[PDB]
Design a protein that fits this description.
The structure is cut from a larger assembly and holds three copies of chain A. By secondary structure, chain A is α+β, with helices and mostly antiparallel strands. Chains A, C: GO terms for molecular function: serine-type endopeptidase activity.
Chain lengths: 649, 646, 649
């Protein structure tokens, strides 16, 4: 009786670990899986849905604070600075996303905002006088319901996850706590990215672009926005000429300097995200001597909800942050006066989210063998791994050689000693890591008798900037070599892996690479290409990041004749005439990162060559289907994976 | 400009003051008036609605505990015996009436029950192990939506406040708190009235009737219902009469009840009776006044508990109506009645108590209802009253039974003003020292309000009640017109040329009777009236017993029916010349709308100026708790009629 | 296996027989019984409904012209004078009652009006240039849906057929046929009763009351309304000071004189309706030597829809009309120059509706043994009796003596010769007749083993004015005597009638009399009182005709003290203490003729005496339940009748 994809339904998903100001408590979000309407379920069609509530721990086993029975539930808990109140966002039917205020010592939450479109991103001011948030307020767009045309004049008009961008960006609003009054603060023309209060509560720092074109090129600046004074608020004032990517604003305790996460101008999206200290328009690198990116970039599929990673000053010299290192994610401290020091770094573990102050730290921790758990000051306060309904297995490391040094990957074997099929899984990005995140999909594959082989070829993100740069402008060369070398090393190192029953699969860049590999070797008996890329030229025109992705990743501009020919030579579809491998195609109609036209071309081309092919087309979902899509569609995706593997081995 | 009926919309209405077990806190219900759906209101039609939330005080200014924005809101707060949780009932849209559990030390409430028709009347067991409640569970009746006939075989099939009685009465259920499990306890064939746990939590006392006929005659008994084990109730008092307010004695064997023993009938004052081994003896001796609040007012929305409570083994706390006031008193096993908290100028309309504290709602003729805990006011609701309140003056009249009393509420200034004779219903209730927004609004709009307690009123001894038995329209009509004449003599500002007469229910009967026997009044407003006592007997939800108890007359017997016709104001309608406004609700089952239709037709046939305001959906309780917009409309129609005729 | 009430569902119901102008064709309405939505019926709840279409015959078997599949269907066919078009009214869902125009030589109907509340009573002008009709147009009344109060200042505010009366009465509109234009003609302040065009198409005659009070007293006048000329139409002009009851205006061919049906001012509602010739403010009786009322006043239960009976001039001297004579309804001609002559009068048959001109006649004919059929110029064109699903039986006449001469009634016996129960059935009115209408209910009673005894006591309408007047002011005396004497004569004349198993039943006045009889004798083993009267005083206040009924029928005014006491002495409820007979009470909540408070008092009183009693309370229905209510509720009423008889015999 081997486990199936519905094992997912047994899991509950933690997110957003928010430490209290006094450091002694953590409030977090837990998504459970329930019926859309448990009162009136459909006899013929099950409807498993995410439903979230707020949980609280003061050191011991966490307890629920809210009890949502309908709607998506409650999210985004935010402590008042006096520790007596939780602001949060509630979603229940026609209540899209309303700001709630919950007294923690007794009584129910009060609804603070009454907007048709709800709110997002609530942040208290440090003095507790204000709550900042964004909202599109009561603006109505009836073009879709009426069947009217959409007129497009802006370079980017779609975004994965948000679908169609609104004509007016969400405005920044201010909740006056003492006066119990709401007020618009700043309506941006383009949009507000990262936001953080100054520690004296005088205003906020915000990231925005100059125009839509600059935004499409991932070029942003930092602005100072003080509290409003008259009936007409003051406008933002440019405070850093950055002209590049920036988020994670971390104002320094002194109220004048601040850190940001990003990359200086010139450097493209392949550059490691790093920490930069800003002082009077000047910048210098803060996380020196640390050849690794800021933030979690390690694969996993048990993350639903918000995972905060904003850097936090523990004192006047010490900035706490997370960083991806060789398939792990640890906490580190950057120092104004010195280099980077480890703070909490298990090389076999992943810290996916954290909050901190001078009095305590809360985080979510996981490994390849341990489901995500919530911790407060080193003490686990959840028991979520115990819900995992079948035994987890431990991967074994297998290395391979490259001219830049040793690369690594892993093999997860089933029980027993008999021959088993070998599955080459390729992570996306390409600048992410496989390794020590928890992957329900991989554990399920091993529980169903497959050997899972997954690795970090050149291009992966946790092994230094040079390892990333090795594939610049030449996808399909040394990255493909590393993947097939790794897989060959797996077959040599683990004799029970059946070299006559192999498959190759991957998503996003891994979908590109699955298409590239099957077009360049017939060795695999089956392939599963997920949210794939087949035509790099059409990607440039249809993707929500097409106006800049190939420029940064390959130095190629699809709108220029000479570059377009190179992009066509890098396109797996050019070589599709050589594909003989039975291929399952999985794609979502509302994927704006890799538009479904990518999958349609691969499907049609394989059909024209009479290659066995199957195309699972998910509606409504986007790129994030395998990590956070609607539960029934995550089941269907997994069912289709195993059905294809069972047919071909 | 003068204030109008919309002054009602500024008010918030307190109810159900529940003292905590340790006596140091009070949780209560506050109804505010908001739009039915503030998100999508109708531009063309305002929809003000009652919406209730729970409030809490530990000695200081009360703070809100719940924040309902849709539906009727939250009601019926009940403390867990350990003081850490509040059970309550939530109604929000399609959620009809769910039992909720709110932890008081932090966190939101959890929903405990999931019935299509919701629940009512939750009561914790004293040990905290159980919550008892009633529900019709998921029973569905599609007769009305499909247009099928209703087959009636039972004597009583409608009840005011509700509509059509269900074929099966609500069953009593048990919530096992520790096990988080629900279970049906007892499905009665007729119905459960009062209910109270034994102090040892072994079971409950319940009031029931034997069959449909006994229920229609208001004859009930008390039963012992133990906790289920593998359970049937056993009769322990042969009462065959009216009983409620079960108050089990701390010793776990004796208990008190409010009611009357079988004999004289329901005109007898309700009293306190101690029960021991099927035996009863009156507990509130030497106190010729009824138990409970029977004083008029119009600022009571929600539940107003008055269940007696043992302060110790000898002392039973209860409320009683005395000459237009309602005070708290203590009855003693070893002695008589002692005053506990009795202002002869004030009304305590609801209270809860234990050995550690008391909470109550208090009001006067000049002071809006407020919540108190151990003598300290914890609300500021009078401050919401949007115009100045004025002080009534007392005016007496003489009868063969002694002095009767009434009051005049005058507007500001010194000029002549019209005189409005208002007649309270019942007839066995009192005017006096309850807060009446309607009367204050009348005075605020330039009218003199005259209101009194004629013989038949309830707070002046049993003899004062009995004086009208079997002869409505004699000495009660005399007292009202005697009182009114004394008002004109005592208060020269009252304009004897601009007079009106008005009243509701029995006051509607009397307004019709008076206009049919004198033309002295320039205008009349008859509200939820009675015009035909014969048809009332057949149509009213209490017609099978009301005239028998009140008059000794059976409409189904020839000789009695003729007497009922001689008591009917419609017999004398040929003498009415007074312009009359008729106010009635279509779903009034206490005084059915056929009463108003006959008066309307009769006046039309005599070409008497007449106007008939017919409210849908509302019932008898419109003026005290109807939907806010229809309470406004009723008041608007009152003043429009008075403005036309003065 | 004996037939049950569902035998009704096999029947189809004819109405409105409209002869063509050339006299060679008939168009009529046929209501069939179908499911509310035959596509989606309710598995647990059947919904049989009337659905009507138009039918046409030119001498032979009639054929359908319309094919309604949803809604109530099509009604009120009206020939254009050139014989080429049918106007009619269509009801289908949200299409409440639209004026349609159907070409008869080919093509489908066009919708002519577009009002929210539809139209009613279409009449072509004789020259074909206009169609007159009434409508409340697009007026909306939202008090009920909003829950607002209704303010009543008018003496009469309800009507049995229309429930609640509107604040503004339906206005008279004009359709300009050649111009295809609609136009308001006259908005009456009180209301328009009968209406007829002048033969020269110059305008219409209309009946109206002076004010609301006069209308409640059944006092009306005739007005002349010419065609409009300017933007504001000319007002109606008073043309006959009648101050009494009037309908059935029949303009004379000379264009100046006209006949009306009604009674002169002096007489009350007990006077036979007669024909009056009007000429320049003068009136004289036209149907002289004919001591019988105009119109069908004979009981039956197979009439659904409109049954026109308007008198028609066959020439300058001859007025065709129908009249009720001893339980029959025949056609007669009144003459300006002479007396009344029989035209088509079967003393065993009932002509319930007719239309005529100088070229032909169409009508509906029935008997006690013959279901209604449609005729054209003497030729039957339907086959509806063949649909009657069980054999009909023939009644036998039984007479009784009165001081005014011999009264008559009938016995309908079951098959066989064994003893059977005897049912005394009492017709309403009281000024109607039993006799020679077709009664499904009686045939079904006999088919289920009951002997049906039904008669015409003094008070009935077909035996002369004196026979009517005999009960004036003293209901419960000689009428009750005649009924029990007739019933006694039945038991004597038919020995198989079981005198130990008898029941008494009746509706309206028959309900009053059923209540009166059980309160004055215990001889009956069961009683069924239908839409009854128990309290004559409360009736005066609650009935839609209470302001005048007792005044005309008894000379008593419930609003006057001395009269009210007499009304109480005539009230069956005074004598309810003597009732011992198990009684079934049938009543409809929206009965405004006999309000349900009448039944509630009888029910309560019987309960107070512990007399076996059962109360069937129908929602939505009115007084007309047994003759035209919703089919499922006619079944339930009949089921309850037989269940009560089966329990007690």
């Amino acid at each position: 009786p081997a486990p199936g994809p519905d094992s997912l339904l047994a899991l509950a998903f933690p997110s957003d670990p928010q430490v209290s100001p006094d450091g002694k408590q953590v409030a977090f979000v837990l998504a459970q899986i329930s019926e859309e309407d448990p009162a009136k379920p459909d006899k013929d069609f099950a409807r498993p849905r995410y439903r979230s509530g707020l949980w609280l721990s003061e050191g011991g086993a966490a307890r629920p604070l809210t009890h949502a029975e309908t709607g998506r539930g409650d999210s985004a808990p935010r402590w008042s600075p006096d520790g007596q109140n939780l602001a949060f966002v509630r979603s229940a039917g026609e209540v899209k996303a309303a700001l709630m205020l919950l007294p923690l010592k007794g009584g129910e939450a009060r609804r603070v905002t009454h907007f048709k479109n709800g709110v997002s991103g609530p942040q208290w001011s440090p003095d507790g006088r204000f709550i900042a948030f964004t909202t599109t307020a009561d603006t109505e767009d009836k073009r879709d319901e009426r069947g009217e045309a959409r007129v497009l004049t802006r370079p980017v008009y779609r975004a994965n996850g948000a679908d169609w961008l609104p004509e007016r960006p969400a405005a920044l609003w201010l909740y006056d706590v003492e006066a119990d009054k709401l007020r618009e603060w700043y309506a941006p023309e383009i949009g507000i990215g990262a936001l953080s209060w100054w520690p004296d509560s005088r205003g906020v720092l915000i990231v925005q672009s100059e125009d839509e074109w600059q935004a499409s090129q991932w070029r942003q600046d930092v602005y100072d926005l003080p509290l409003p004074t008259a009936d007409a608020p003051a406008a933002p004032q440019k405070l850093l000429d950055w002209n590049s990517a920036a988020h994670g604003l971390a104002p320094h305790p002194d109220g004048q300097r601040f850190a940001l996460i990003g990359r200086p101008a010139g450097k493209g999206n392949t550059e490691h995200a790093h920490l930069y200290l800003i002082e009077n328009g000047q910048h210098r690198r803060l996380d020196t001597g640390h050849d690794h990116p800021v933030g979690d970039a390690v694969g996993g599929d048990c993350h639903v909800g918000a995972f905060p990673e904003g850097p936090r000053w523990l004192d006047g010299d010490t900035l706490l942050f997370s960083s991806t290192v060789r398939g792990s994610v640890g906490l580190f401290t950057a120092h104004i006066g010195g280099g980077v020091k480890a703070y909490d770094h298990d090389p076999q573990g992943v810290i996916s989210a954290f909050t901190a102050n001078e009095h305590g730290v809360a985080l979510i921790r996981e490994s390849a063998t341990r489901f995500p758990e919530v911790e407060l000051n080193g003490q686990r306060v959840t028991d979520l791994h115990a819900r995992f309904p079948f035994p987890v297995r431990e991967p074994q490391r297998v290395t391979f050689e490259t001219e830049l040094g040793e690369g690594e990957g892993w093999v997860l074997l089933p029980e027993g000693e008999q021959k088993v099929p070998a599955l080459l899984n390729i992570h996306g990005g390409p600048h992410t890591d496989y390794g020590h995140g928890f992957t329900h999909e991989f554990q399920l594959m091993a529980a169903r008798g497959y050997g899972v082989c997954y690795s970090n070829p050149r291009g992966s993100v946790g092994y230094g900037q040079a390892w990333v740069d090795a594939i610049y402008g030449r996808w399909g060369t040394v990255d493909a070599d590393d993947l097939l070398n790794f897989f060959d090393r797996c077959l040599e190192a683990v004799p029970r892996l059946d070299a006559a029953k192999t498959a190759v699969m991957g998503g996003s860049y891994g979908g590109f690479m699955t298409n590239w590999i099957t077009g360049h070797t017939t060795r695999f008996q089956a392939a599963i290409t997920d949210r794939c890329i087949s035509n790099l030229i059409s990607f440039g025109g249809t993707s929500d990041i097409g106006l800049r992705f190939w420029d940064d990743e390959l130095g190629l501009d699809f709108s220029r004749r000479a570059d377009a020919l190179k992009l066509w030579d890098l396109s797996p579809l050019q070589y599709v005439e050589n594909v003989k491998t039975p291929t399952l195609i999985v794609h979502s109609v509302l994927d704006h990162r890799c538009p479904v036209e990518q999958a349609e071309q691969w499907y049609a081309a394989l059909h024209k060559h009479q290659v066995p092919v199957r195309f699972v087309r998910f509606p409504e979902e986007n790129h994030e289907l395998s990590r956070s899509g609607r539960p029934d569609r995550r089941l269907t995706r997994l069912n289709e994976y195993f059905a294809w593997l069972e047919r071909w081995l």
